Design a protein around this ligand. Structure first.
Ligand SMILES: NC(=O)c1ccc[n+]([C@@H]2O[C@H](COP(=O)([O-])OP(=O)(O)OC[C@H]3O[C@@H](n4cnc5c(N)ncnc54)[C@H](OP(=O)(O)O)[C@@H]3O)[C@@H](O)[C@H]2O)c1
Ligand SMILES: CCc1nc(N)nc(N)c1OCCCOc1ccccc1C[C@H](C)C(=O)O
Length: 166
């Protein structure tokens, strides 16, 4: 029951405790439970990603189903079969609800407009290295709930944070 007419911009990411979210063009862990959670949050909404995050999805899974896929690139002729390609965030955020799904550069671009963050914290020890993609560091305007730790089937421990701001 949200009145029509507004544009909710959310960020969603999964990070190691160190803040690492990406390395070698991939996510350096596998957490099917987090993929299910990611699908549930974003389903039915527009999803915006950087060109490198588009490249990081296997060809056989993209575009992600049930969502309008939007890819941010400076290459006007970039080929993202089944997605919209835009050259700035100006016209990427026009839906009633948009989820920015990564990666490092696009989170920083969209953070100023975001009022929700859905964060998965993965208890993996990965100290930051040169070239890693990192999560945004939220400031004090954000408030939210910290979920309980839970074990994935692989035995990796993780928890969900749901943050909001006005
Ligand atoms: N939750 C997670 O853990 C998570 C989620 C998503 C992604 N990732 C990972 O994060 C890493 C990718 O993140 P990243 O920071 O390296 O790249 P990215 O943010 O996904 O995409 C970067 C690209 O976006 C375009 N871009 C950036 N700023 C732009 C601007 N102002 N205007 C127009 N286009 C702009 C450029 O594309 P062009 O070069 O084509 O011009 C830039 O190369 C990968 O390792 C991925 O696996 C992790
Ligand atoms: C589930 C990862 C994730 N998790 C969270 N919490 N936030 C995010 N932005 C986020 O990234 C979504 C974009 C990258 O997707 C992936 C990368 C590497 C392996 C597996 C997937 C999942 C597949 C491709 C799928 O969803 O179909």
């Amino acid at each position: 029951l949200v009145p029509r007419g507004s544009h909710m911009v959310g960020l969603i990411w999964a990070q190691a405790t160190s803040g690492v979210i990406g390395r070698g063009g991939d996510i350096p862990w596998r957490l099917p439970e987090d993929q299910a959670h990611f699908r549930e949050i974003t389903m039915g909404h527009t999803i915006v990603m950087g060109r490198r995050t588009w490249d990081s999805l296997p060809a056989k899974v993209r575009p992600l189903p049930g969502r309008r896929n939007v890819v941010l690139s400076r290459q006007a002729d970039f080929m993202a079969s089944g997605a919209e390609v835009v050259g700035s965030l100006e016209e990427a955020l026009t839906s009633p609800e948009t989820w920015v799904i990564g990666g490092g550069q696009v989170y920083a671009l969209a953070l100023p407009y975001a009022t929700r963050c859905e964060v998965t914290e993965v208890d993996i020890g990965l100290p930051r290295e040169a070239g890693d993609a990192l999560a945004p560091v939220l400031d004090e305007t954000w408030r939210g709930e910290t979920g309980e730790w839970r074990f994935s089937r692989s035995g990796l421990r993780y928890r969900l944070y749901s943050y909001h701001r006005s």
